[PDB]
Amino acid sequence: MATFVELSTKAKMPIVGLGTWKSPLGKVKEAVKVAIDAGYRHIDCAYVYQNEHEVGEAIQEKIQEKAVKREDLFIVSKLWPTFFERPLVRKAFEKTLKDLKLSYLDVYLIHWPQGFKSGDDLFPRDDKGNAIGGKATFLDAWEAMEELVDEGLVKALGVSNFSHFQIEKLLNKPGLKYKPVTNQVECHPYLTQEKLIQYCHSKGITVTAYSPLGSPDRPWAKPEDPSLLEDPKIKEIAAKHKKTAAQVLIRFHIQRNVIVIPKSVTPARIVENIQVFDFKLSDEEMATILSFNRNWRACNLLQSSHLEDYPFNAEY
Numbered sequence: 001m002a003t004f005v006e007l008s009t010k011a012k013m014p015i016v017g018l019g020t021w022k023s024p025l026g027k028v029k030e031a032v033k034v035a036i037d038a039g040y041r042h043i044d045c046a047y048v049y050q051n052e053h054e055v056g057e058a059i060q061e062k063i064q065e066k067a068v069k070r071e072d073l074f075i076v077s078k079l080w081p082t083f084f085e086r087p088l089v090r091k092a093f094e095k096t097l098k099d100l101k102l103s104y105l106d107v108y109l110i111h112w113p114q115g116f117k118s119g120d121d122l123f124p125r126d127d128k129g130n131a132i133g134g135k136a137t138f139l140d141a142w143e144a145m146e147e148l149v150d151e152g153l154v155k156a157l158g159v160s161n162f163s164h165f166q167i168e169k170l171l172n173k174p175g176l177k178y179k180p181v182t183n184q185v186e187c188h189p190y191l192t193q194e195k196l197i198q199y200c201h202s203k204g205i206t207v208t209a210y211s212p213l214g215s216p217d218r219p220w221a222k223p224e225d226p227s228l229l230e231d232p233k234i235k236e237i238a239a240k241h242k243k244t245a246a247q248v249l250i251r252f253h254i255q256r257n258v259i260v261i262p263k264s265v266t267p268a269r270i271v272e273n274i275q276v277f278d279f280k281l282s283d284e285e286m287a288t289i290l291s292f293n294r295n296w297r298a299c300n301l302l303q304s305s306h307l308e309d310y311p312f313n314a315e316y
């Protein structure tokens with residue numbers, strides 16, 4: 001049973017959730033079932049993961065078997081930037097909701113701030129592999145997403161991969177109806193996000209930490225890239241508590257009041273990753289982990305740096 005972080009809407013978002021990026025069909029259903037059995041209530045999904053239909057099946061199973069009630073689940077999905085045009089926001093959301101077999105989403109996020117070429121080519125690219133932009137902006141998207149909230153199809157909106165400049169742009173938009181309840185960004189001891197977390201919290205916006213284990217399975221990983229799970233200094237703190245490195249990496253965020261969404265399809269690891277409420281990292285250990293900051297991104301998306309709303313050029 002995970003604790004919660006209170007949102008500005010007073011909704012309670014479970015502080016540990018299950019990630020589903022790259023969770024294969026044929027394993028993601030069982031993964032979600034095991035997670036719910038283990039006490040997970042928060043599941044992080046996305047249209048672009050192309051597995052929401054199988055996540056939906058798992059959720060429906062557990063509900064109809066009395067393992068969990070819908071009101072106790074916390075389901076998050078994301079709008080992909082090829083769908084920022086108003087009519088496409090609705091169509092994309094409807095596909096997400098139908099796949100998940102749900103009547104509503106708890107949170108719906110703008111997945112990335114830069115608009116891409118509109119349509120169902122999810123990764124429109126040139127010959128070099130650079131993203132092709134679209135003229136519809138995240139503000140255009142937000143307008144259409146606000147309708148879903150008006151209609152009760154989504155309880156709250158949020159953003160992902162936004163810098164403080166972009167969040168400012170959103171918050172300071174004249175005629176804003178709903179405010180973002182979270183900003184989901186990469187966060188871990190190599191990218192501690194101190195300034196961005198400080199900013200978000202000061203605006204009543206929570207932070208959701210993605211790739212908390214450093215996303216070791218990411219396709220573009222090079223053998224020289226830093227590895228959090230094998231970091232001797234992380235492992236030292238784990239050993240001190242007779243816990244795993246993964247558990248330390250997860251507990252790190254909990255103690256900063258930051259939501260964290262580790263991904264696994266491995267039953268043992270799914271359980272392991274939520275066994276993080278029976279120990280505490282000391283003040284000194286937290287400081288030590290914070291000192292590991294390298295401003296290193298596993299998810300740099302250099303292929304889109306040429307587009308207007310590239311979030312990672314700013315300091316925070």
Ligand SMILES: NC(=O)c1ccc[n+]([C@@H]2O[C@H](COP(=O)([O-])OP(=O)(O)OC[C@H]3O[C@@H](n4cnc5c(N)ncnc54)[C@H](OP(=O)(O)O)[C@@H]3O)[C@@H](O)[C@H]2O)c1
Pocket residue numbers: 018019020021022044045111160161184185209210211212213214215216217229244246247261262263264265266269270272273299
């Ligand atoms: N908003 C965004 O733009 C964005 C970007 C990236 C990710 N996300 C979200 O955040 C979630 C988590 O990030 P991520 O998937 O990039 O990477 P991650 O959770 O940091 O790492 C996942 C990898 O670590 C392995 N693993 C999981 N638990 C482990 C453990 N206890 N010990 C050792 N290895 C373990 C998994 O293997 P197995 O699965 O084989 O067990 C998987 O290969 C994603 O699934 C997605 O939901 C969002």
Ligand SMILES: COc1c(Br)c(Br)c(Br)c(Br)c1Cn1c(=O)ccn(CC(=O)O)c1=O
Pocket residue numbers: 021046048111123124125129130131299301303304
């Ligand atoms: C595979 O490399 C690319 C390329 Br090329 C482009 Br263009 C984009 Br956009 C992305 Br987001 C990626 C990476 N990527 C995916 O493809 C799918 C999901 N994610 C994570 C997320 O946003 O949740 C990626 O980073």
